[PDB]
Amino acid sequence: SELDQLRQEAEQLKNQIRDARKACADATLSQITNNIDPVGRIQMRTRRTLRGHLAKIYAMHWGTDSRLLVSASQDGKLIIWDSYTTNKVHAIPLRSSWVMTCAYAPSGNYVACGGLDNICSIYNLKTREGNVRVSRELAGHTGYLSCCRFLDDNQIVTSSGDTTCALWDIETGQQTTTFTGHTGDVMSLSLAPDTRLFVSGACDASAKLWDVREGMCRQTFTGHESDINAICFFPNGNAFATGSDDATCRLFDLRADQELMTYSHDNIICGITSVSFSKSGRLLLAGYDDFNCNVWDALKADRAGVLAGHDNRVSCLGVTDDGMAVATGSWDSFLKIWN
Amino acid sequence: DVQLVESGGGLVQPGGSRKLSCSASGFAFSSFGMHWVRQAPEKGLEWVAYISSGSGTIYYADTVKGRFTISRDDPKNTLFLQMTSLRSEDTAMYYCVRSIYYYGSSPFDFWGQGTTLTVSSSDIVMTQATSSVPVTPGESVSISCRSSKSLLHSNGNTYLYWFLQRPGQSPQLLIYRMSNLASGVPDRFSGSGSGTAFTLTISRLEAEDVGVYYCMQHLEYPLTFGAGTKLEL
Amino acid sequence: GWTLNSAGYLLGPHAV
Amino acid sequence: SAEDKAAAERSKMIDKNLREDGEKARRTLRLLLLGADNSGKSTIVKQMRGTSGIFETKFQVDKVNFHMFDVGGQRDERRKWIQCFNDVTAIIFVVDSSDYNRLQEALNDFKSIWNNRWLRTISVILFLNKQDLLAEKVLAGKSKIEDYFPEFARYTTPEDATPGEDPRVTRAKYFIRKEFVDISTASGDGRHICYPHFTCAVDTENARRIFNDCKDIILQMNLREYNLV
Amino acid sequence: NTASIAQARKLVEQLKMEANIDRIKVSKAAADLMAYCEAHAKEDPLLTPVPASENPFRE
Amino acid sequence: EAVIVPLLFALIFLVGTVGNTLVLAVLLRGGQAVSTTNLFILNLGVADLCFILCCVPFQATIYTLDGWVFGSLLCKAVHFLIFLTMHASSFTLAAVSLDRYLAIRYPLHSRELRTPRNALAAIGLIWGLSLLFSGPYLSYYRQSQLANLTVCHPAWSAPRRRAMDICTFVFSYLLPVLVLGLTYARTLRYLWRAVDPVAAGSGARRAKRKVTRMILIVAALFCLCWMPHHALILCVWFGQFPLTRATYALRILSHLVSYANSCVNPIVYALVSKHFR
């Protein structure tokens, strides 16, 4: 009854924003960024190589003090590394071998993991008994998880492949709010530096801003073709970058709802698996399927380096808070700390 | 809860043998190192031995090298110390201590109750210059130790520890790297120093602060305590 | 052809 | 460095324990299940004995451990969790050969699974759990395959016989089977082999076909590591 | 409302909040990130070279 | 004459030096991809690489110039690494031939005993036995002075030379062949037994035939490469050797054939399959 009538009006509404977006579009940063000295070739080599994993690596997360990090794999083991002396602080055995995400609490007392079992688990690192044990169980998602992120020490944000993202309360264990409005599987998520807003990347060629307290989809951005694999906040709080299966990265802005740059090359055809900035919004490290990472340039859209020390597909990469090191996981079952 | 209970004391003839034992419970007694510490009657504290997790590396005190033996039984959850040919200087009170070593851990957390043994009739030296101090509640008191060598390492740590031996009690941690404060004590306590000279700092004193202050280094395994510093009202 | 070294290497000492 | 020397000792006690876990984990072999609602995946396992979609059944044959990764409740899209299963030794696929209407979409699943970018090394073990229904359906003659599949005008039995029975039933069985095989023999390059089989709901010796075909899957890769092929 | 065409109405309703936000000139936003990089360029030992002595990981 | 011999030795030296290096280069790069299969191939390349470097360059010096002038302790050193590698390059070929049979007959039940930690024990054992048989060659060759010429001929007496020459023949050629030839007979028999093939396009027509052809190639070099070299020493002792121009050309040809077992092993074993191509 109302399906046909409402569809016609919906299409007109989209065109009004599209015309407004086109009208509001003034210029492009490609021409403006022509009066800046190029960064030049950037070369880094491994300083450490973390051995001990016996399966493909899915995700990793750095620490607050830029010395400790955690990683997960198909081995079903969660490992905390000392990136300085290559020592192993802890080795946490997971409950389900199929996991896709990791997190490290800002205070440093907790970690998190989740995956195909539709649960994000919480572990207490600093206990009196001298062992690491699970403290909170978080269930209530009908699809596999893709990203868990702590807010301060007691609120975690989760995005799964069931079209919805939810905000939790660790102490009580119930969803305080629920965020919905997507269409397909959600793959990536990133919290703002001020921990007030966050974005989400779905398998819909669409990404949406959010408000944590209320639960209202503030904005919606489209433009990609295939699914969206990775998302991350620019270290200012006004932008974010999305990595899709089109072998293309592109930069969004929160005051324009339009793309600014697109990082692509004819030779590059393989898809993108991870994206993260580094401490200045000047280097954009992307991890592709063609057996190596890639160091982009978020202002000039040109290549500046390759992390070609890996012999398999790179699935994760992160950068320290201090901006010192850059780890990188892949399917070699090896973790390499570059600099 | 965590509790170390130990026994095996008594009277030993000058030349006999004796064996002590701890009883670890309430914690994973498979990832912690272990120690022993003496206390001569109305004197300080001194080491007896050491053993790590997995019984890998052992160290001994030079005073009793080749005469004491320390053994471990992980499934039994019990630590052992065997003494042979006891002399007349071995009359003291023995303590059981746990220690875990990884990045950020606090060694020497828990101390045992202690047993008394009686017998019938190159190193870093630290001296506590001050012996006794009369204190009043509500004031600030600074307590210092002196070091033979600088404890600062190339890492950036400074292996200095502090302990509280209240009357009829056992020592407990306050500060374990001259800066960091062990969990379970009020924030009024503090510690500071640089390389050679060290000092404590207490803001507001209360009634349950009377005892003896001891200081430690953790650089060279022949580890040595300090003298006694008594605080009295 | 056959030299002093070549015959010594094969037949041995004395007669080469 | 006295404390640092003891930290580096537990890191090597952890390494010793991690390597032990890798020795006990490579003893087993990994398997999948794909099929339809009425295909009969569950009944195959039973004869050989919340939202947790992974059933994860296990069975034993000839002193070799097997783990079968039955994943269910996978929403609507499948192409996002297949890439997590690209390390198995074989994929088990079940087809309803009885329901003629639900056969063109049985081939649809096979064609797309046979051509995954993440499943370009794993060989499929094709199954056909419905065999008794075909014999009873052709004898009764409720419907004719010609309307669904108008290819009987150019097909005949190519000198094959299986026990004896009605040759009318056997020629019907072969047309469906060679329909699936003809899809397979278009992209494999020695790294893919289908192993089609005919099974019923009473057949019990299913586990041998998984076991025997797992020798060839591993034998054919020992001939490749040795540069024999 | 929760009807048979609720998703059609839901998309229509949510869209007008998004279209009711203030829009800023792209040129102002184009040069926003340009000036930001100059303000935090020094504190990044991956863009500018880092000495081997003052490098916890290299040394 | 003096033109043919230096060029032929140089060409064989170039081929052997190049070929063994590529096998080592491909195996070594990257790392962490070494299993029981790759460990044995790595040992084969190392043993054969050394042989070319310490046998070809100076054995031509016997036929070119007068005597051994360059080196005094080398007349005792090189004659130890000539037979050390020759005894280890032929003992690994009897270990690949036996490893290749366990991984074919039992592909499922032979995964316990084929661990990389269990392959290094056999690699160490192979090199341990090489020192035992090649050890007594330190006193076999000694520098001397005949007609005021510095040469290092064999020094032992005639009764003590027959025993050493036979022992090298038995323990380096005759014995490995009876192990490398018997196993390849069982693999070819099992691979072609009367069992219904899985398929006809590649089940038996293509896969089972290339393995049969490629095994027969390997079993044919080892029997023919080191046969004529041992077929000349036997004639010297138990027969008559005229030491003339008629039989002189066979002596140089005997050395040349022996080097083929080391310049082709890196090719047949490694540079054939697409995994190394």
PDB file of C-alpha atoms in Angstrom, chain B residues 15-176:
ATOM      1  CA  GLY B  15      75.605 -29.398  64.784  1.00  0.00           C
ATOM      2  CA  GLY B  16      72.304 -31.143  64.099  1.00  0.00           C
ATOM      3  CA  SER B  17      69.887 -30.637  61.227  1.00  0.00           C
ATOM      4  CA  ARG B  18      66.441 -29.158  60.648  1.00  0.00           C
ATOM      5  CA  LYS B  19      63.984 -28.588  57.806  1.00  0.00           C
ATOM      6  CA  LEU B  20      61.379 -25.851  57.347  1.00  0.00           C
ATOM      7  CA  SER B  21      58.438 -25.577  54.972  1.00  0.00           C
ATOM      8  CA  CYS B  22      55.986 -22.991  53.643  1.00  0.00           C
ATOM      9  CA  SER B  23      52.345 -23.681  52.744  1.00  0.00           C
ATOM     10  CA  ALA B  24      51.207 -21.524  49.829  1.00  0.00           C
ATOM     11  CA  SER B  25      47.461 -21.190  49.306  1.00  0.00           C
ATOM     12  CA  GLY B  26      45.049 -18.805  47.630  1.00  0.00           C
ATOM     13  CA  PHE B  27      47.307 -18.012  44.664  1.00  0.00           C
ATOM     14  CA  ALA B  28      48.981 -19.681  41.686  1.00  0.00           C
ATOM     15  CA  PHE B  29      52.148 -21.055  43.283  1.00  0.00           C
ATOM     16  CA  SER B  30      53.596 -21.887  39.865  1.00  0.00           C
ATOM     17  CA  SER B  31      54.541 -18.472  38.414  1.00  0.00           C
ATOM     18  CA  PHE B  32      56.090 -16.873  41.523  1.00  0.00           C
ATOM     19  CA  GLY B  33      59.675 -16.986  42.673  1.00  0.00           C
ATOM     20  CA  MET B  34      60.400 -17.666  46.319  1.00  0.00           C
ATOM     21  CA  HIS B  35      62.739 -16.378  49.009  1.00  0.00           C
ATOM     22  CA  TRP B  36      63.730 -16.736  52.645  1.00  0.00           C
ATOM     23  CA  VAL B  37      64.664 -13.977  55.098  1.00  0.00           C
ATOM     24  CA  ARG B  38      65.988 -14.164  58.657  1.00  0.00           C
ATOM     25  CA  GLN B  39      65.587 -11.863  61.635  1.00  0.00           C
ATOM     26  CA  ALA B  40      68.060 -12.179  64.488  1.00  0.00           C
ATOM     27  CA  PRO B  41      66.637 -11.407  67.961  1.00  0.00           C
ATOM     28  CA  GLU B  42      66.276  -7.608  68.122  1.00  0.00           C
ATOM     29  CA  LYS B  43      68.300  -7.148  64.930  1.00  0.00           C
ATOM     30  CA  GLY B  44      67.714  -6.547  61.228  1.00  0.00           C
ATOM     31  CA  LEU B  45      66.938  -8.945  58.378  1.00  0.00           C
ATOM     32  CA  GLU B  46      69.097 -11.139  56.148  1.00  0.00           C
ATOM     33  CA  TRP B  47      68.725 -13.531  53.215  1.00  0.00           C
ATOM     34  CA  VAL B  48      68.942 -17.313  53.157  1.00  0.00           C
ATOM     35  CA  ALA B  49      68.271 -18.450  49.583  1.00  0.00           C
ATOM     36  CA  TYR B  50      66.285 -17.962  46.355  1.00  0.00           C
ATOM     37  CA  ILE B  51      64.507 -20.108  43.766  1.00  0.00           C
ATOM     38  CA  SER B  52      62.658 -19.215  40.569  1.00  0.00           C
ATOM     39  CA  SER B  53      59.631 -20.631  38.743  1.00  0.00           C
ATOM     40  CA  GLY B  54      60.313 -24.036  37.245  1.00  0.00           C
ATOM     41  CA  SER B  55      63.326 -24.490  39.557  1.00  0.00           C
ATOM     42  CA  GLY B  56      65.546 -23.006  36.866  1.00  0.00           C
ATOM     43  CA  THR B  57      68.053 -20.727  38.603  1.00  0.00           C
ATOM     44  CA  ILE B  58      69.024 -20.792  42.283  1.00  0.00           C
ATOM     45  CA  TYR B  59      71.133 -18.352  44.295  1.00  0.00           C
ATOM     46  CA  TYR B  60      72.478 -18.654  47.833  1.00  0.00           C
ATOM     47  CA  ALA B  61      73.887 -16.414  50.532  1.00  0.00           C
ATOM     48  CA  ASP B  62      77.675 -16.515  50.764  1.00  0.00           C
ATOM     49  CA  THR B  63      77.443 -17.017  54.533  1.00  0.00           C
ATOM     50  CA  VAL B  64      75.700 -20.380  54.058  1.00  0.00           C
ATOM     51  CA  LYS B  65      76.788 -21.425  50.572  1.00  0.00           C
ATOM     52  CA  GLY B  66      77.263 -25.175  50.366  1.00  0.00           C
ATOM     53  CA  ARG B  67      75.436 -25.798  53.654  1.00  0.00           C
ATOM     54  CA  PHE B  68      71.739 -25.020  52.981  1.00  0.00           C
ATOM     55  CA  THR B  69      69.442 -26.526  50.349  1.00  0.00           C
ATOM     56  CA  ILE B  70      66.160 -25.111  49.020  1.00  0.00           C
ATOM     57  CA  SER B  71      63.700 -27.409  47.242  1.00  0.00           C
ATOM     58  CA  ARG B  72      60.308 -26.901  45.615  1.00  0.00           C
ATOM     59  CA  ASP B  73      57.213 -29.057  45.026  1.00  0.00           C
ATOM     60  CA  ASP B  74      54.769 -27.328  42.677  1.00  0.00           C
ATOM     61  CA  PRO B  75      51.931 -29.923  42.839  1.00  0.00           C
ATOM     62  CA  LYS B  76      52.350 -30.140  46.622  1.00  0.00           C
ATOM     63  CA  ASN B  77      52.230 -26.319  46.974  1.00  0.00           C
ATOM     64  CA  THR B  78      55.063 -26.212  49.499  1.00  0.00           C
ATOM     65  CA  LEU B  79      58.533 -24.654  49.712  1.00  0.00           C
ATOM     66  CA  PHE B  80      61.403 -26.339  51.558  1.00  0.00           C
ATOM     67  CA  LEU B  81      64.707 -25.386  53.184  1.00  0.00           C
ATOM     68  CA  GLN B  82      67.154 -27.987  54.517  1.00  0.00           C
ATOM     69  CA  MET B  83      69.803 -27.040  57.088  1.00  0.00           C
ATOM     70  CA  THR B  84      72.912 -29.073  57.915  1.00  0.00           C
ATOM     71  CA  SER B  85      75.390 -28.613  60.783  1.00  0.00           C
ATOM     72  CA  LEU B  86      73.597 -25.734  62.478  1.00  0.00           C
ATOM     73  CA  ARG B  87      75.871 -23.213  64.188  1.00  0.00           C
ATOM     74  CA  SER B  88      75.182 -20.794  67.049  1.00  0.00           C
ATOM     75  CA  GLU B  89      74.672 -17.804  64.718  1.00  0.00           C
ATOM     76  CA  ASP B  90      71.678 -19.388  62.942  1.00  0.00           C
ATOM     77  CA  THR B  91      69.206 -18.524  65.726  1.00  0.00           C
ATOM     78  CA  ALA B  92      66.735 -16.160  64.049  1.00  0.00           C
ATOM     79  CA  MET B  93      63.177 -15.911  62.708  1.00  0.00           C
ATOM     80  CA  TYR B  94      62.627 -17.121  59.144  1.00  0.00           C
ATOM     81  CA  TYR B  95      60.123 -15.685  56.663  1.00  0.00           C
ATOM     82  CA  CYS B  96      58.585 -16.850  53.381  1.00  0.00           C
ATOM     83  CA  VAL B  97      58.314 -14.355  50.509  1.00  0.00           C
ATOM     84  CA  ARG B  98      56.845 -14.503  46.991  1.00  0.00           C
ATOM     85  CA  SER B  99      58.028 -12.581  43.930  1.00  0.00           C
ATOM     86  CA  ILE B 100      56.901 -12.416  40.291  1.00  0.00           C
ATOM     87  CA  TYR B 101      59.103 -10.849  37.610  1.00  0.00           C
ATOM     88  CA  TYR B 102      57.620  -9.438  34.415  1.00  0.00           C
ATOM     89  CA  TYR B 103      57.179  -5.929  33.035  1.00  0.00           C
ATOM     90  CA  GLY B 104      55.417  -3.932  35.744  1.00  0.00           C
ATOM     91  CA  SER B 105      55.030  -6.549  38.473  1.00  0.00           C
ATOM     92  CA  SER B 106      55.690  -5.887  42.165  1.00  0.00           C
ATOM     93  CA  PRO B 107      58.070  -8.416  43.757  1.00  0.00           C
ATOM     94  CA  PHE B 108      58.079  -9.152  47.500  1.00  0.00           C
ATOM     95  CA  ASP B 109      54.312  -8.694  47.879  1.00  0.00           C
ATOM     96  CA  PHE B 110      53.409 -11.159  50.628  1.00  0.00           C
ATOM     97  CA  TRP B 111      55.355 -12.218  53.723  1.00  0.00           C
ATOM     98  CA  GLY B 112      54.784 -15.218  55.969  1.00  0.00           C
ATOM     99  CA  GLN B 113      54.055 -15.240  59.678  1.00  0.00           C
ATOM    100  CA  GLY B 114      57.459 -16.618  60.630  1.00  0.00           C
ATOM    101  CA  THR B 115      59.021 -19.397  62.701  1.00  0.00           C
ATOM    102  CA  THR B 116      61.686 -19.173  65.405  1.00  0.00           C
ATOM    103  CA  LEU B 117      64.741 -21.445  65.448  1.00  0.00           C
ATOM    104  CA  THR B 118      67.033 -21.598  68.482  1.00  0.00           C
ATOM    105  CA  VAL B 119      70.301 -23.412  69.192  1.00  0.00           C
ATOM    106  CA  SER B 120      71.354 -24.304  72.729  1.00  0.00           C
ATOM    107  CA  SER B 121      74.670 -23.016  74.059  1.00  0.00           C
ATOM    108  CA  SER B 122      82.102  -6.912  46.895  1.00  0.00           C
ATOM    109  CA  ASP B 123      78.612  -6.221  48.255  1.00  0.00           C
ATOM    110  CA  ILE B 124      76.392  -3.145  48.324  1.00  0.00           C
ATOM    111  CA  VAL B 125      76.341  -1.960  51.945  1.00  0.00           C
ATOM    112  CA  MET B 126      73.436   0.175  53.161  1.00  0.00           C
ATOM    113  CA  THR B 127      73.395   1.827  56.584  1.00  0.00           C
ATOM    114  CA  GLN B 128      70.499   3.720  58.149  1.00  0.00           C
ATOM    115  CA  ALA B 129      72.272   6.674  59.755  1.00  0.00           C
ATOM    116  CA  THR B 130      69.320   7.565  61.991  1.00  0.00           C
ATOM    117  CA  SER B 131      68.361   5.016  64.652  1.00  0.00           C
ATOM    118  CA  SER B 132      65.296   6.366  66.490  1.00  0.00           C
ATOM    119  CA  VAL B 133      63.058   9.391  65.927  1.00  0.00           C
ATOM    120  CA  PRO B 134      60.358  10.821  68.233  1.00  0.00           C
ATOM    121  CA  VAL B 135      57.300  11.767  66.184  1.00  0.00           C
ATOM    122  CA  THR B 136      53.977  13.504  66.769  1.00  0.00           C
ATOM    123  CA  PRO B 137      50.695  12.903  64.920  1.00  0.00           C
ATOM    124  CA  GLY B 138      49.836  15.263  62.086  1.00  0.00           C
ATOM    125  CA  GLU B 139      53.425  16.174  61.181  1.00  0.00           C
ATOM    126  CA  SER B 140      55.657  15.126  58.273  1.00  0.00           C
ATOM    127  CA  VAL B 141      58.607  12.785  58.852  1.00  0.00           C
ATOM    128  CA  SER B 142      61.383  11.976  56.370  1.00  0.00           C
ATOM    129  CA  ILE B 143      63.305   8.695  56.672  1.00  0.00           C
ATOM    130  CA  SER B 144      66.466   8.023  54.682  1.00  0.00           C
ATOM    131  CA  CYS B 145      68.889   5.255  53.732  1.00  0.00           C
ATOM    132  CA  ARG B 146      72.453   5.443  52.423  1.00  0.00           C
ATOM    133  CA  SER B 147      73.736   3.381  49.496  1.00  0.00           C
ATOM    134  CA  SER B 148      77.227   2.098  48.742  1.00  0.00           C
ATOM    135  CA  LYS B 149      76.619   2.191  44.973  1.00  0.00           C
ATOM    136  CA  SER B 150      74.099   3.964  42.763  1.00  0.00           C
ATOM    137  CA  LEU B 151      71.060   1.762  42.124  1.00  0.00           C
ATOM    138  CA  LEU B 152      69.993   3.476  38.888  1.00  0.00           C
ATOM    139  CA  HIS B 153      70.327   1.125  35.915  1.00  0.00           C
ATOM    140  CA  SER B 154      70.509   1.710  32.172  1.00  0.00           C
ATOM    141  CA  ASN B 155      66.810   0.796  31.964  1.00  0.00           C
ATOM    142  CA  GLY B 156      65.753   3.758  34.107  1.00  0.00           C
ATOM    143  CA  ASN B 157      64.541   1.864  37.189  1.00  0.00           C
ATOM    144  CA  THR B 158      65.915   2.211  40.720  1.00  0.00           C
ATOM    145  CA  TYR B 159      65.719  -1.002  42.752  1.00  0.00           C
ATOM    146  CA  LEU B 160      64.740   0.374  46.158  1.00  0.00           C
ATOM    147  CA  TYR B 161      62.071  -1.099  48.437  1.00  0.00           C
ATOM    148  CA  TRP B 162      60.483  -0.215  51.777  1.00  0.00           C
ATOM    149  CA  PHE B 163      58.895  -2.252  54.555  1.00  0.00           C
ATOM    150  CA  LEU B 164      56.854  -1.808  57.748  1.00  0.00           C
ATOM    151  CA  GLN B 165      57.584  -4.112  60.690  1.00  0.00           C
ATOM    152  CA  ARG B 166      54.995  -3.117  63.289  1.00  0.00           C
ATOM    153  CA  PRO B 167      55.258  -4.653  66.783  1.00  0.00           C
ATOM    154  CA  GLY B 168      54.202  -8.282  66.566  1.00  0.00           C
ATOM    155  CA  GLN B 169      53.772  -8.159  62.781  1.00  0.00           C
ATOM    156  CA  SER B 170      55.581  -8.887  59.502  1.00  0.00           C
ATOM    157  CA  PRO B 171      56.954  -6.435  56.922  1.00  0.00           C
ATOM    158  CA  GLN B 172      54.779  -5.201  54.064  1.00  0.00           C
ATOM    159  CA  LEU B 173      55.447  -3.299  50.851  1.00  0.00           C
ATOM    160  CA  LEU B 174      54.901   0.425  50.518  1.00  0.00           C
ATOM    161  CA  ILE B 175      57.212   1.467  47.648  1.00  0.00           C
ATOM    162  CA  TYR B 176      58.899  -1.052  45.358  1.00  0.00           C
TER     163      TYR B 176
END
